[PDB]
Design a protein around this ligand. Structure first.
Ligand SMILES: *[C@@H]1O[C@H](CO)[C@@H](O[C@@H]2O[C@H](CO)[C@@H](O)[C@H](O)[C@H]2NC(C)=O)[C@H](O)[C@H]1NC(C)=O
Lengths: 30, 50
């Protein structure tokens, strides 16, 4: 894999997840 | 319908009342500006992050 992650770390990263731009245009950035 | 809105309920698109064309509206560039400096007891040069 290009991420150098384990068979379980990949599952965990897949199992957890215009709005961003709309909020950014109101002055709130991340 | 004449103009559209996004999730945040602000004007996103408009309709030109001379050619029936729909134009998307986006705000022009803006952001924050930070200054990276060592101590003034060391140097006066700085760097800028946009
Ligand atoms: C407002 O009037 C102008 C001028 O007559 C119109 O512009 C022309 O509209 C015709 C409509 O068949 C087009 O074929 C032409 O190409 C238009 N002119 C140009 C330079 O493009 C315009 O459409 C009118 N707007 C309305 C009626 O909403």
């Amino acid at each position: 894999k290009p991420s150098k992650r384990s068979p379980i770390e990949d599952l965990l990263f897949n199992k957890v997840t215009d709005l961003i731009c709309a909020q950014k245009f109101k002055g709130l950035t991340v | 319908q004449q103009f559209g809105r996004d999730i945040a309920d602000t004007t996103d698109a408009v309709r030109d009342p001379q050619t029936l064309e729909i134009l998307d509206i986006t705000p022009c560039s803006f952001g924050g500006v930070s200054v990276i400096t060592p101590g003034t007891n060391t140097s006066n040069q700085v760097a800028v992050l946009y």
